[PDB]
Amino acid sequence: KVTTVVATPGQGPDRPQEVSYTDTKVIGNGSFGVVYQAKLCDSGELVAIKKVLQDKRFKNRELQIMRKLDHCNIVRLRYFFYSSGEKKDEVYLNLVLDYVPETVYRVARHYSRAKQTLPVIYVKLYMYQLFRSLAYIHSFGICHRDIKPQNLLLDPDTAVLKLCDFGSAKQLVRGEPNVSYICSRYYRAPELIFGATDYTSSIDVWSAGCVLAELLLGQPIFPGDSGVDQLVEIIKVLGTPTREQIREMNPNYTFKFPQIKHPWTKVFRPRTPPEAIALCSRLLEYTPTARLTPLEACAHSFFDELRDPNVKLPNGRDTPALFNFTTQELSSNPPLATILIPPHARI
Numbered sequence: 001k002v003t004t005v006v007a008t009p010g011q012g013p014d015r016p017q018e019v020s021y022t023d024t025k026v027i028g029n030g031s032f033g034v035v036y037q038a039k040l041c042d043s044g045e046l047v048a049i050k051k052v053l054q055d056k057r058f059k060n061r062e063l064q065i066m067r068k069l070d071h072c073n074i075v076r077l078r079y080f081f082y083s084s085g086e087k088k089d090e091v092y093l094n095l096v097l098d099y100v101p102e103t104v105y106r107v108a109r110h111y112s113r114a115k116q117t118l119p120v121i122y123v124k125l126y127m128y129q130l131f132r133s134l135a136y137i138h139s140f141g142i143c144h145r146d147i148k149p150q151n152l153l154l155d156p157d158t159a160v161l162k163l164c165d166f167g168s169a170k171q172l173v174r175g176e177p178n179v180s181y182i183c184s185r186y187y188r189a190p191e192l193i194f195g196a197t198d199y200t201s202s203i204d205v206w207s208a209g210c211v212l213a214e215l216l217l218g219q220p221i222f223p224g225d226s227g228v229d230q231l232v233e234i235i236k237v238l239g240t241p242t243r244e245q246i247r248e249m250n251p252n253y254t255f256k257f258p259q260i261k262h263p264w265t266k267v268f269r270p271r272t273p274p275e276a277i278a279l280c281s282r283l284l285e286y287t288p289t290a291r292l293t294p295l296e297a298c299a300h301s302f303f304d305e306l307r308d309p310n311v312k313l314p315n316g317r318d319t320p321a322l323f324n325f326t327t328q329e330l331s332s333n334p335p336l337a338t339i340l341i342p343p344h345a346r347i
């Protein structure tokens with residue numbers, strides 16, 4: 001069964017073209033809608049198709065965001081098209097994206113089930129690429145607002161990571177309030193748990209620190225099915241937030257909390273590299289402004305191994321693209337290019 005549509009390319013002028021695809025199968029489900037895998041008849045390339053119900057009252061925000069993004073660590077919008085679907089008188093928006101075969105969720109789960117941890121070389125590769133994608137979207141004021149292992153796609157052979165799911169993504173403008181009910185259980189910044197509506201893009205940095213700690217630990221660092229439980233777990237590690245730290249995140253919670261004074265070194269297994277622990281404590285900070293920015297995290301000494309000219313993947317292959325930064329990508333701190341682009345790098 002070959003399906004032919006007239007799809008509009010994701011980038012460039014709005015000039016639709018006939019796109020034919022086959023071998024369609026569901027690869028993802030959720031409250032958002034459905035993600036399919038399909039094969040393009042023309043090149044044989046595999047693609048993913050996110051199908052969502054299109055609102056008649058407004059333009060789709062995820063599509064407007066996707067059309068402006070062009071980064072090697074973000075899943076690319078190749079085409080988009082409208083169609084019918086499961087509901088009779090409803091219109092669906094279909095986003096044709098690059099296909100990526102794995103997720104950090106599945107890969108980390110394979111390691112947990114085998115009582116092994118993901119090798120630190122992969123922790124550095126995956127986390128570095130996640131921080132590059134965040135530096136990129138944050139350069140446009142865009143916050144993803146749902147960073148979690150399931151949204152981090154991976155090609156296991158090339159070790160390329162691609163951020164996906166821009167369904168919660170929004171441009172955060174200072175002074176505009178934003179819903180606090182975004183972000184998934186385990187990865188929510190403490191200001192979100194306290195119900196702040198004045199949060200910044202640093203909520204993505206807290207989420208990324210939770211993914212890093214989880215990859216190091218083999219399980220989530222701040223588990224819990226309620227905000228109280230999550231905050232107890234946060235406080236056990238970070239200690240009790242001071243009145244200033246509360247004011248900096250929370251919206252008027254000045255506080256019957258348990259009093260805890262805990263060393264970050266004792267949180268992880270003894271074989272954990274000290275630079276990984278130092279990176280965690282800098283991402284996972286109560287005060288949103290104290291957290292490292294994504295570009296500062298990229299320049300962290302934990303990723304120095306990635307900058308070594310002789311670094312190779314365990315499978316023998318070369319590392320993926322890591323130093324092809326743009327002016328846009330570096331704009332939050334241009335002097336960091338001196339660390340970020342190593343002498344051997346030609347990108």
Ligand SMILES: O=C(Nc1cnccc1-c1ccccc1)c1ccnn2c(NCC3CC3)cnc12
Nearest residue numbers: 027028035048097098099100101102150164165
């Ligand atoms: O954009 C995507 N997915 C999403 C977009 N919005 C919301 C949710 C999702 C989602 C993310 C992960 C899983 C299920 C759904 C998406 C893009 C590209 N490849 N891809 C895959 N590959 C197959 C790998 C094995 C799982 C799976 N999902 C994708």
